[PDB]
């Protein structure tokens, strides 16, 4: 394992400077991306907003999608 200079034995003499594809306080970490889910699933088109219900009747499926 010579010609390799392993990390477990590299005195602080040897040390590396991190380069761009890596986070560091000097260069800016530009924006990232995530997936935002469909919305609240329903039987009509999924929506983000919750609405009132006329027929409450615990455990029943009644809506007025058409407004």
């Amino acid at each position: 394992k010579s010609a390799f200079n392993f990390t477990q034995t590299t005195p602080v003499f040897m040390d590396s400077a991190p380069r761009w594809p890596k986070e560091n306080p000097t260069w800016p970490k530009n924006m990232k991306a995530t997936m935002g889910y469909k919305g609240i699933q329903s039987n009509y088109l999924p929506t983000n907003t919750v609405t009132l219900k006329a027929v409450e009747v615990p455990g029943t499926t009644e809506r007025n999608f058409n407004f």
């Binding site: 039987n43 009644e62 007025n64 999608f65 407004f67």
Partner: protein
């Protein structure tokens, strides 16, 4: 090219022929004298060599006393004088006479018309049978005529709009019998059979129309509003143009079950429109309302196998799919499990036309629903009671047996009804 043949049999057959053909003449600007001041009319008419637009229909009956009214009415320059077929003696509310004695001697004439009525036809959608079950001419001739149509074309589709005997309203006493005999002959021969009762359409004229002196001329002004809505796609542009074959594929699950219900909405007086908006949302809740049925059946005792909705007017599909979606969730409406779907929807941009002197109101949104349900066994079991109540004494039989019939034709046509009601229970 998108054309149909409209047959009218019996009295109520031609009684609705006067309402339907007063609509198409008015819906296309066709004057009563044939001519008007394509394919917008080719569904129902045939431009001759010059100007004239004759209809493609046939008025068939045995009593001249009504077909001659058409000959003297304002629509006498309209029809080809041979289409208005008539006879000398009548069926006399006796299924045998309309089937065995008198039926056999004019069908050979009527059939020649159809052959000469189909040659000009290049692409025939399907026959259209306006029938009134309960009379000798309606039940006998209709039965004898349908069998002749099956063996000639077979591949063409027959749609049966048959007025059915109501529970309470009954303009006859022997109408149970000939209503039973009709089944064994219509069932195997019609492709699909719509039903409607003179009683259910009476109450529609009470709550909605608020007309207190209803008459046969009033109700027929409602049926014409159905067929106008039913065949709008055949002659008027619109999103989701629905032909007949498409309409028929996704409604009839089994070759037996082709007895379906109808509805219409909105049905309102020309003044209560001032108290409503009649949105696409509001109408489709009323089409599935039990009081808006054209038959005295209760869909809440059964289940739905399919529905078909033909909207009309200022309607966009984004609101159709929304109002249909809030109905599958409603608890009252039960759909049989083997169809999670069940709606074929049709839209047109041509709003329903209104006739001067009618009772409906000029609107921009209208719905006609046609549902295949398993609750239809109700109206079909009442007949199985009155027939078995009177036939226990052989009452009125000596009329049927005296006209070239027998006693087997009663018990035979009786089992066919039991054979049918099981089919409306195997689907449970």
């Amino acid at each position: 090219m998108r054309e149909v043949i409209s047959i009218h049999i019996g009295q109520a057959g031609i009684q609705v022929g006067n309402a339907c053909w007063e609509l198409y003449c008015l819906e296309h600007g066709i004057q009563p004298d044939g001519q008007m001041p394509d394919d917008a009319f080719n569904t129902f008419f045939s431009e001759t060599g010059a100007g004239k637009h004759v209809p493609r229909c046939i008025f068939l009956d045995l009593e001249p006393t009504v077909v001659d009214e058409v000959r003297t009415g304002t629509y006498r320059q309209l029809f080809h004088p041979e289409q208005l077929i008539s006879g000398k003696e009548d069926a006399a509310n006796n299924f045998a006479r309309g089937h065995y004695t008198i039926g056999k001697e004019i069908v050979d004439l009527a059939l020649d018309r159809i052959r000469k009525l189909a040659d000009n036809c290049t692409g025939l959608q399907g026959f259209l049978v306006f029938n009134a079950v309960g009379g000798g001419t309606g039940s006998g001739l209709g039965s004898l005529l349908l069998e002749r149509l099956s063996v000639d074309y077979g591949k063409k589709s027959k749609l049966g709009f048959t007025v059915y005997p109501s529970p309470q309203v009954s303009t006859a006493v022997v109408e149970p019998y000939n209503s039973v005999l009709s089944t064994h002959s219509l069932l195997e021969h019609t492709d699909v059979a719509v039903m409607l009762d003179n009683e259910a359409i009476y109450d529609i004229c009470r709550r909605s129309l608020d007309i207190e002196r209803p008459t046969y001329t009033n109700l027929n002004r409602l049926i014409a509003q159905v067929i106008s809505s039913l065949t709008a796609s055949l002659r008027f542009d619109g999103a989701l143009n629905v032909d007949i074959t498409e309409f028929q594929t996704n409604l009839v699950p089994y070759p037996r079950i082709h007895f379906m219900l109808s509805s219409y909405a909105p049905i309102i007086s020309a003044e209560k429109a001032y108290h409503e908006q009649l949105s696409v949302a509001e109408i489709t809740n009323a089409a599935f309302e039990p009081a808006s049925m054209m038959v005295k059946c209760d869909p809440r005792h059964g289940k739905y196998m399919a529905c078909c909705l033909m909207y009309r007017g200022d309607v966009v599909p984004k609101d159709v799919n929304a109002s249909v979606a809030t109905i599958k969730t409603k608890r009252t409406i039960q759909f049989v499990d083997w169809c999670p779907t069940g709606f074929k929807c049709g839209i047109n941009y041509q709003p329903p036309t209104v006739v001067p002197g009618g009772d409906l109101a000029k609107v921009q949104r209208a719905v006609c629903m046609i549902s295949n349900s398993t609750a239809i066994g109700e109206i079909f079991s009442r007949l199985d009671h009155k027939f078995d109540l009177m036939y226990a004494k052989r009452a009125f039989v000596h009329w049927y047996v005296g006209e070239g019939m027998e006693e087997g034709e009663f018990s035979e046509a009786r089992e066919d009804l039991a054979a049918l009601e099981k089919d409306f229970e195997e689907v449970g």
